[PDB]
Write a protein that binds this DNA or RNA. Sequence first.
RNA 1: CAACGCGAAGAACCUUACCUACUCUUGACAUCCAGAGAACUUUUCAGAGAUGAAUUGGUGCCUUCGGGAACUCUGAGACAGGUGCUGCAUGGCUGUCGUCAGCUCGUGUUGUGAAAUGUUGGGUUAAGUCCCGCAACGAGCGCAACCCUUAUCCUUGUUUGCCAGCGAGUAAUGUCGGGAACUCCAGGGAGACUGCCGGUGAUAAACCGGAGGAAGGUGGGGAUGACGUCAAGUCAUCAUGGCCCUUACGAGUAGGGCUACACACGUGCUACAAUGGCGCAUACAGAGGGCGGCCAACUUGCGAAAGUGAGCGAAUCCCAAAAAGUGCGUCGUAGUCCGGAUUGGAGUCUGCAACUCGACUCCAUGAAGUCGGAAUCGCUAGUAAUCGUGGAUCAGAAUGCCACGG
Lengths: 86, 127, 100, 203
Amino acid sequence: MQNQRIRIRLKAFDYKLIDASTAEIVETAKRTGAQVRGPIPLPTRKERFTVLISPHVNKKARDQYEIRTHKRLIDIAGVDVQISLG
Amino acid sequence: AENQYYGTGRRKSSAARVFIKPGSGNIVVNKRNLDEYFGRPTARMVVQQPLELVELTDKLDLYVTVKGGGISGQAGAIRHGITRALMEYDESLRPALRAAGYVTRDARCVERKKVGLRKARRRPQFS
Amino acid sequence: AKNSMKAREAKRAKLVAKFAEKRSALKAIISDVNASEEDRWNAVLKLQSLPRDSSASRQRNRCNQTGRPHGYLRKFGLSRIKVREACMKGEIPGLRKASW
Amino acid sequence: QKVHPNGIRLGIVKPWNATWFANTKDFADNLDGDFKVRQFLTGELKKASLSRIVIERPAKSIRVTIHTARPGVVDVEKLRAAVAKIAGVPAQINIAEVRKPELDAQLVGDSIASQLERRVMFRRAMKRAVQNAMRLGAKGIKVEVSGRLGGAEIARSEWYREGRVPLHTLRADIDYATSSAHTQYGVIGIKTWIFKGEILGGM
RNA sequence: CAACGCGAAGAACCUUACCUACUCUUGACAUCCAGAGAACUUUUCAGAGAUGAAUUGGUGCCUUCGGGAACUCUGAGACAGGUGCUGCAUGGCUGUCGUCAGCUCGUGUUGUGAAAUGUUGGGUUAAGUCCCGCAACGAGCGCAACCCUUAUCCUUGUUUGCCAGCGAGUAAUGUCGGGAACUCCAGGGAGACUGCCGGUGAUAAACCGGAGGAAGGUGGGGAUGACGUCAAGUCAUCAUGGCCCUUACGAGUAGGGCUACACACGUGCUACAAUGGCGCAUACAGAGGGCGGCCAACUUGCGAAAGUGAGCGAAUCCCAAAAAGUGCGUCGUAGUCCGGAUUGGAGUCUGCAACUCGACUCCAUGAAGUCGGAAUCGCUAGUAAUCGUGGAUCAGAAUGCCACGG
């Protein structure tokens, strides 16, 4: 019988909000009838941006920002759910 | 499992999974052989150094899987893997290996490039 | 930027959405390996005639909050200067200062 | 010279004014939307004591939060409708009272800014703010007014500090805000710091 | 010093601020007001183009129904516009001393007073660090800590990653059943405190050494820059007082230019060779990017590439090959099997367009250079040196820059 698991892929810029949401799901699935086999940390992306800090010159003067993106797989505002019934 | 002693060992960006078995000097690296993996001899010495010390060179079978880094990195990763493997066997093999600077994980890893610098330390030349 | 330099780029963006299909089609004749060399020339001819500003190459990505032509970043759409001022104020989500 | 107080503490003790996940495509549009929304709301709520516009994007929508000293002054339907237009997505607008509005760096500076635009003594405005804050229970406060002060031909920068303002302490809950008094002599900057006590335990 | 691979994280056009020429003045851009036309859509002539005049289809919304909108156009004058000037009128931002250990205040005391004291002194510390002394006693900004990362361990979980023990395969494949061990990934914890021992010192601070320990005395690196100094930089990111220009210092377009070169300097890259070149064989990374994107495979081409065709919005697919290394030959130490400039010629690719002025490929051409005066720069350890690799900007264009490992 063709398997139809629920590969959920949460993506967020905050790991605590992603963790709030991993609980939300797993809890609910457990508050119904569903095994989760879940939250599976997938490697956190880290975009980085070395911007010049001065309005004019001063090239060595520079700030470096990052946007880390956390991603969790559960295999049944800020969080990006992507349910994949396969 | 068998009498399969296991120890991890890291060095620079390399990580050796080192499995040890009662045996007769069968050193295996990533399904190649000790000398068939590392060429220049240092490496294979370095791997053996803790074996040479405990004096089980040809009383042991090494099933080493190592990833990451380079030759020296991997060599050193395994040395550290075996050190931990050897102390997984006899728990009072420590002082020998400890005092031979084998038990220490060498934390030294590449220093990051830094804005305004060519590298970690190297500055631009100046007028 | 000067208000005209901003205006020039609004127009360009208008003129690229307008002619995308036509340009792309023409270009996809100045190319087709098993096309006619004669029709190939006619495709070349029509693409000389379309408004130059309909070329997307002729767009300079500019800062959305100002119009700084240099120092751009696509992820955000702002110049370095505005990216920073936004980040510090906490207005770009996820983006903080980074050390490692 | 000095890092932005809100900048360094984002993630540590200071929350974000925008919470939405976007992938690169959308990210830059979402950012430009937010700017338009902020620029609009700020431009309308000039006499509503606005501090902080928090812009969520819950799925395909935009929730705003006008944190304000004057939930009364906020009309809301028109704002909701106007934001919904600019964003091009079903907008909500929520309101939050700034309960103690003289322990809010943004308002404190906006106050001083107004006062300096009405031609008040810069020392008078600065000093009253410091006192009100330290009375309402600021663990400290700095205010630095910079410009042509009392329309001086040479710009200077005066600042008063009462209490602690431990800027290098990251666990410190420091509220910062620049304002600008636009006057006949020129722009006059009002930086305001307000230390409301180190937050042990993280964010 | 703290300008000179700096603004510029990428000048063919665009960018662009400049120039020459052609063009327009309520204007390229904005609000207001009135009237007209939906918007738009072809297709066409002229022109370098901007624009102008001709050419068809469409003419919907919202209904008070002379109405809503909205867009287009023209007219009105208020206004618009200015990368014009002033950074010595400013805000904001930045460099610098320098992550140097300082800079100060309240109260008290001393002095006619400017002021002093605290903050000095004895030790100590990376540190105005700490401890003793002491008319000072307290406090603030700095120091340190709190943050990120990296060393080791535990716990929770296990796919797109893993493969110890598992059985079954394939030309090989973790291939695939299966495993949750391990590497790893990521959330939560543990750990380092001079805590412990010995010695030293004022029994102080602390210092020297030792044990344990992945780690030892701030473990390593990053972030974090006191009060101020230089009327330091930036009115050209933006903002802004004033000033100035408003048929022009505003606006549109086309072609030039910023790429010019007698030369000087700054910063780089590549060399001068055998610790090398060259051919062949063969091994080990980290990090990152990707939808008008990254492009597998196949076929074609010497090749750039082109056909052509998957997969992948990504621990899945792709970029993608590590290179220094190792193994074996060859060169035989010289202007060479060093070096790669320059130029001729034939191309590919991006783009409306590569003449000025792109990159790349192929063929040939094979310059300077034989380790560099005085002088001067960087570096104290996973550092320097060397080796490749990725990224932003980006149609195309990286010896720069940011970053990653060997």
